[PDB]
Ligand binder design. Structure first.
Ligand SMILES: [Mg+2]
Ligand SMILES: [Mg+2]
Ligand SMILES: [Mg+2]
Ligand SMILES: [Mg+2]
Ligand SMILES: [Mg+2]
Ligand SMILES: [Mg+2]
Ligand SMILES: [Mg+2]
Ligand SMILES: [Mg+2]
Ligand SMILES: [Mg+2]
Ligand SMILES: [Mg+2]
Ligand SMILES: [Mg+2]
Ligand SMILES: [Mg+2]
Ligand SMILES: [Mg+2]
Ligand SMILES: [Mg+2]
Ligand SMILES: [Mg+2]
Ligand SMILES: [Mg+2]
Ligand SMILES: [Mg+2]
Ligand SMILES: [Mg+2]
Ligand SMILES: [Mg+2]
Lengths: 97, 121, 196, 105, 95, 51, 140, 287
RNA sequence: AAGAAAUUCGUACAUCUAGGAGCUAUAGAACUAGUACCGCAAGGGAAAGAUGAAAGACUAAUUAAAAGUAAGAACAAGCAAAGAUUAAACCUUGUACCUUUUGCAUAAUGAACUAACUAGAAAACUUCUAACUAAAAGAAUUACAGCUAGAAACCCCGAAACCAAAC
RNA sequence: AACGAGCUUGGUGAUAGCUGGUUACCCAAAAAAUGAAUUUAAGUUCAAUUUUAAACUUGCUAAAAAAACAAAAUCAAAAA
RNA sequence: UCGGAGAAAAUCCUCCGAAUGAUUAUAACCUAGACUUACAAGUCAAAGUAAAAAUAUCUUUGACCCAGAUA
């Protein structure tokens, strides 16, 4: 194997930038706020997995269910093929019956 | 078929000449056995393997003290060929609480109660 | 609780293409027999350079889960006790300050032996005094939050906690309500007999 | 590994014990971090055991250097000129004391 | 069976099990005897009586039937006038 | 280019070892090198010999 | 390639450092070097037991040479020294033969002396008293 | 608490000092080392090792166990059977003793649900609560309780102490509203009418001995006395009782709540109830 | 194997163009390019680059460092080493690796060598750790000590084929 | 430019009970290749073994008479 | 596929039969404890109750689904 002959530039991390300093604030919005909002409503991400979790087959089906009708042809064809592959893997293949 | 063997009783009935040869009185029989394993139980049937562990003779050339009673003797007869049986002898008597820590078992089969590691003088 | 706070928001955007999603790869490269080569059916299989990834990250993935409401409330009580018993908690009547200079606030923290970082809590965002708002705005390690914003993770990140007296009453009421309560018949945002 | 390595004969530095016994270890250096988890055990060694070791061995000069440090390190120098260095990173007090005695012997 | 269904992502019950076996809440499974309705004209009276009975299933059979059905079939059902009311519980079972 | 600062740091120590072998440094007296106190060393000299 | 091993250089040097004194591609090519190093280590471990036995064979040969100079076979030298309650081991007997020839001649005379007493004793039938050097110092 | 005194001595708690509870995490094993690598736990090469063994319940080609057993209607019609949550007098006394159920006012399914004494699942085919005789010997409360089913012994305990018990029918739509009234109010619909029992349950709820809500009141005195003679207690004249007005209270067969008629709209936001004035609607609701 | 609906719930961050416990030249797009090249055609389809502030300062350096060679061919004897030894070789000990074959290798496959890349993935039950407890759960679920949350799991490459539409 | 049926793309990561491969250390335990069914004998499911955890109590070797046989194993009082 | 018999608990070891009928005093229901047995299937049976006023006597096999016939 070959190794770097020089040290890379040192990594400088600001631990007190606004994002790091205020991380976690309002995670108790419900219990401390009379439950008007659930903490999951603060999660930013893809529309089909905000406040939700699942295995890859579940995620693929959930994305199709949410935004399947707004997807590009290449993407939708690839997503549909992924569902059929995962369907056959989880329901027919594995050590444990 | 290899099977467990029953020895005819005559084998264990001694002769008058035997007592002279081995120097044991048919009366006042010895009380405790000194038994050592001198052969391996590998290549021997499993029943012989079992008794050797029951009798404590797992390590070779390490003596075990056993009762000279018929039930124990029955087990010893099963493995008679893999062991050496020597009568335990007490020249100076049984060890007491005072002498329990000063004993030594000699190769002769005698349990001395005083072991000095000094010339007899 | 602190691990929940970090891991329930997390969504990873790492992805790799499987053999099915890399460009090309349809035709069989060469015949099975009479070649002297290893058998292959596609130039995009994982064994090839430029091929698909066998078990790589798949799409956007979420780590969402929820700790029980009593557990998360219990964590805040433990955190508040830890700050008090370790002499990191300072109860204040009000956050009013004589001057808006951020230097004054930093100097006061040194004088009173506060930590390098301080977390300040006020009852509500709307009524927080102007002077403290200006002072904390420019201070990286002095952070001002309202009472509804209090959390275990921020308390661990900041060395000392400053609570106003009204906030303490606010905090006690909400946390002690969690024990001695029923299970919910329906979400608490809906009207109840005795719950605000 | 015997034929892949060097060997020597049994020996002593200067006929160490014929007339009088001389301790070959002559200098020990201990580098610490004032505030670093990995140097905790070494810090406890300095608080409790370093002073006793120095008194028991008055012919060894012991240098304790607290400074910003990532890994605590012990350097041992002998009269024959040999130098041995030991990483003490996150070792308990007893292990460091046990190791320090080995260097002296 | 289906471990992760396409639409809901759930386990699916094998309905042929639900159509042949009864689960008591304690964990036991009931069944009929194979052939109890077949060729009764040539079976002995004692044989017919044995066939008519409801019979329990073994530990392995119970384990298999548990895998082939979902949790909905393992719940407590409070049916008024249930004829199996007493058999959903075990009494004086030391083991 | 593999991720990591640590492997680069390790190989720097390997480079130093090779450099010393090829062009060994000119020997320097222990007084110049760090961790030296003359007064303490002189006393230890006497204590070492039990004199 | 989110996670790639970055230390493979030192893992490779672990094997190759042991192979540098081999000849051929064994000494520098890891795939070949690793196989050779594993055989060298197995040989070293088994040679540790064999070394002890070979040294004893060397001592017995050297003792036979020394004893034959005085006219004694190896069994006669060893057993009759044992019968005199002398418990010198074979390793030490070689050191005396090479470096203390006058002492070793005394041992040969003692061994031959005890051997002759044994010959007379067997013909004695037990009526004859025991030999001067054939007496055993008892312990208790 | 000496443990809190220990915290005083120790260093600050922080994100760098955190540790999970001991044994809370098992180790995940990857097939990389020799122990769990190599064949990786799958055994020698075969159908199972390649991951393609037959489905659960397949027995290698012989007719499987779950298929050779005859079909029999154990679970026929299971989803259409009605289920009644059992409430014992022992549990009822426990709730009354701890103040979770108020004996001064009449007790209906809403009060039992509000006090968490019973948990109702209409979606899982619950039709209400049945009184269960267990705890009858030690029941010493005077109560007015409405249940869907009741047993002879349970009714005896209620009446002997001076209380009143009636059996009333609620339909699946009515049951959900009764169990959770407030969520219904937020919908903004008017209160619906209560449907009469199915033809199967009409005999039960029109029988005096069951204290049916549709049963003839004139036949109650005979039925109440009969239990007294059978179970060896003296029937108490409840008219003299001061709380007779509360004890005698009963809902109309088409009413879900005590003081709210069908068709009204509950404006919780403004603390008002709106009543329809259209005649045709009033005929619909009054029916 | 497939699989509803009735019926309940949902104002979704809203504001302005943001974000990454995503990749960093065999990775990430096939892409420096649908190019070069290959095919009559449909179609298939690559590879690679690295000075400094300044080149209007002669284009930078940095590295016992891969295999391969050279500097420096060899010297009775043997899986090439190990024990050793004053001594490199001599003496002594020693039937290459992986995979399989019955647990057997003088069998039979696979490997010229170096570098990089290249294959175990899911929570029904069970176990461990906690919250609260005849109740648990942030609505719909389970409950005759349960219920809730966490942690804990089940690979890769390879046919002859079959079908649809183009050429 | 290798037609018992062209070529290209796509279905497609076709399928393969078949061949090959399946990447750190340490500690511990360990079957057997037996019986049964199978378009099953190049595979699978169950028994049997093995194993981890837990509960509480006898187990292993031996074992008189004595029956069962016909005129060395099955059974297993006491003990050891 | 199963049953009977020798070897004697092996065999491509050697024989006979069965996919039965006859015979009738018509031979219920319910229920301890056991046999046999991978599963499935197959055996024996006290007590209690009920018909009558001795059992049936000779000595076997086909599951599930799905179709029939009836009260
Ligand atoms: Mg493709
Ligand atoms: Mg194709
Ligand atoms: Mg293919
Ligand atoms: Mg790629
Ligand atoms: Mg030897
Ligand atoms: Mg329920
Ligand atoms: Mg590229
Ligand atoms: Mg490319
Ligand atoms: Mg080179
Ligand atoms: Mg040689
Ligand atoms: Mg061949
Ligand atoms: Mg895994
Ligand atoms: Mg052609
Ligand atoms: Mg395949
Ligand atoms: Mg096969
Ligand atoms: Mg068939
Ligand atoms: Mg016994
Ligand atoms: Mg059975
Ligand atoms: Mg009878």
């Amino acid at each position: 194997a070959f190794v770097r002959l020089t040290l890379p530039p040192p990594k400088v991390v600001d631990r007190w930038n606004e994002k790091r300093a205020l991380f976690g604030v309002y995670d108790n919005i419900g219990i401390l706020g009379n439950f008007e909002k659930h903490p999951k409503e603060l999660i930013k991400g893809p529309v089909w997995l905000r406040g939700w979790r699942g295995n890859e087959l579940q995620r693929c089906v959930r994305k199709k269910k949410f935004v399947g009708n707004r997807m590009f042809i290449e993407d939708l064809h690839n997503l549909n093929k992924r569902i059929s592959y995962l369907y056959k893997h989880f329901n027919r293949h594995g050590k444990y019956r | 078929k290899f099977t467990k063997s029953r020895i005819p009783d005559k084998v264990f009935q001694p002769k008058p000449e035997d007592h002279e040869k081995y120097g044991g009185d048919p009366q006042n029989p010895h009380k405790l056995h000194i038994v050592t394993r001198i052969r391996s139980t590998k290549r021997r049937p499993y029943w012989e393997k079992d008794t050797i562990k029951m009798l404590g003779l797992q390590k070779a050339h390490s003596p075990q003290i056993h009762k000279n009673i018929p039930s124990v003797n029955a087990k010893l007869k099963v493995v008679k060929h893999l062991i050496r049986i020597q009568p335990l002898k007490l020249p100076q008597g049984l060890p007491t609480e005072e002498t329990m820590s000063s004993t030594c078992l000699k190769s002769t089969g005698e349990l001395v109660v005083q072991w000095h590691l000094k010339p007899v003088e | 609780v602190a691990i929940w706070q970090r891991n329930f928001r997390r969504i990873s955007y790492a992805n790799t293409k499987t053999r099915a999603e890399v460009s090309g790869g349809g035709r069989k490269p060469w015949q099975q027999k009479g070649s002297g080569r290893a058998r292959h059916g596609s130039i995009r299989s994982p064994l090839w350079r430029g091929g698909g990834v066998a078990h790589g990250p798949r799409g956007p993935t979420s780590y969402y889960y929820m700790l029980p409401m009593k557990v998360r409330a219990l964590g805040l009580k433990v955190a508040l006790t830890v700050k008090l018993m370790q002499d990191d908690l300072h109860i204040v009547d009000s956050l009013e300050l004589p001057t808006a200079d951020p230097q004054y606030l930093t100097e006061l923290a040194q004088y009173r032996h506060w930590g390098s970082s301080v977390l300040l809590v006020d009852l509500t965002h709307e009524e927080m005094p102007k002077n403290v708002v200006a002072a904390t705005s420019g201070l990286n390690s002095f952070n001002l939050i309202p009472a509804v914003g209090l959390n275990v993770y921020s308390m661990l990140k900041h060395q000392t906690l400053v609570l106003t007296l009204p906030s303490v009453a606010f905090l006690e009421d909400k946390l002690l309500w969690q024990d001695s309560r029923y299970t919910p018949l329906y979400p608490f945002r809906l009207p109840y007999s005795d719950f605000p | 590994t015997g034929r892949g390595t060097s060997s020597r004969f049994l020996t002593s530095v200067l006929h160490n014990g014929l007339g009088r016994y001389v301790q070959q270890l002559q200098r020990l250096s201990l580098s610490l971090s004032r505030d670093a988890p990995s140097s905790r055990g070494a810090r406890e060694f300095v608080e409790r055991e370093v002073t006793d070791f120095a008194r028991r061995n008055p012919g060894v000069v012991v240098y304790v250097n607290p400074r910003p440090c990532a890994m605590p390190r012990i350097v041992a120098e002998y009269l024959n000129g040999a130098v041995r260095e030991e990483n003490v990173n996150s070792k308990s007090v007893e292990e460091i004391k046990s190791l320090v005695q080995k260097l002296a012997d | 069976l289906t471990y992760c269904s396409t639409r809901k992502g759930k386990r699916k019950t094998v309905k042929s099990v639900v159509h042949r076996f009864l689960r008591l809440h304690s964990g036991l499974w009931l069944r009929r005897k194979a052939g109890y309705k077949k060729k009764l004209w040539k079976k002995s009276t004692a044989r017919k009586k044995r066939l008519r009975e409801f019979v329990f299933c073994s530990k392995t059979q119970s384990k298999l039937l548990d895998k082939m059905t979902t949790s909905f079939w393992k719940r407590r059902n409070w049916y008024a006038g249930d004829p199996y009311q007493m058999y959903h519980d075990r009494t004086n079972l030391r083991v | 280019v593999k991720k990591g600062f640590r492997a680069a740091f390790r190989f720097q120590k390997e480079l130093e070892r090779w450099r010393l072998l090829r062009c060994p440094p000119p020997p320097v007296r222990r007084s110049e090198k760090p961790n030296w106190d003359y007064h303490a060393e002189v006393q230890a000299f006497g204590s070492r010999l039990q004199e | 390639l989110r996670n790639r091993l970055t230390d493979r250089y030192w893992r490779v040097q672990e094997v190759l450092k042991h192979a540098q004194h081999f000849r051929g591609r064994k000494n520098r090519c890891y795939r070949l070097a690793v196989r050779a190093v594993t055989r060298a280590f197995v040989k070293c471990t088994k040679a540790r037991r064999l070394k002890k036995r070979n040294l004893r064979t060397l001592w017995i040969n050297r003792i036979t040479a020394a004893s034959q100079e005085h006219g004694l076979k190896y069994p006669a030298f060893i057993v009759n020294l044992i019968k005199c309650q002398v418990e010198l081991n074979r390793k030490v007997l070689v050191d005396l033969a090479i470096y203390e020839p006058k002492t070793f001649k005394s041992l040969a005379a003692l061994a031959k002396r005890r051997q002759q007493e044994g010959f007379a004793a067997a013909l004695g039938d037990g009526k004859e008293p025991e030999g001067i050097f054939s007496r055993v110092v008892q312990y208790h | 608490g000496t443990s809190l005194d220990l915290l005083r001595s120790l260093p600050r708690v922080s994100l760098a000092n955190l540790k999970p509870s001991p044994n809370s995490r098992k180790r995940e094993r990857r097939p990389r080392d020799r122990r769990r690598g190599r064949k990786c736990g799958r055994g020698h090469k075969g159908e199972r090792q390649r991951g393609t063994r037959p489905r659960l319940g397949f027995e290698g080609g012989q007719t499987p166990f779950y298929i050779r057993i005859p079909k029999y209607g154990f679970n026929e019609g299971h989803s259409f059977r009605h289920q009644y949550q059992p409430l014992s007098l022992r549990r009822l006394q426990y709730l009354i003793d701890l103040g979770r159920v108020d004996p001064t006012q009449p007790i209906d399914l809403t009060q039992l649900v509000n006090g968490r004494g019973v948990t109702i699942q209409p979606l899982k085919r619950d039709y209400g609560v049945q009184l269960v005789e267990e705890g009858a010997d030690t029941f010493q409360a005077k109560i007015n309780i409405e249940v869907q089913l009741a047993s002879e012994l349970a009714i005896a305990a209620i009446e002997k102490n001076g209380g009143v018990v009636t059996t009333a029918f609620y339909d699946p739509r009515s049951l959900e509203i009764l169990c959770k009234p407030i969520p219904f109010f937020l919908r903004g619909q008017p209160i619906p009418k209560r449907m009469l029992p199915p033809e199967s349950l009409v005999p039960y709820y029109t029988d005096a001995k069951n204290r049916g809500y549709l049963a003839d009141p004139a036949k109650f005195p005979e039925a109440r006395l009969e239990l007294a003679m059978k179970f060896g207690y003296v029937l108490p004249d409840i008219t003299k009782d001061e709380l007779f007005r509360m004890l005698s209270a009963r809902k109309d067969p088409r009413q879900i709540f005590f003081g709210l008629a069908p068709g009204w709209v509950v404006n919780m936001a403004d603390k008002k109830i709106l009543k329809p004035t259209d005649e045709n609607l009033l005929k619909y609701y009054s029916s």
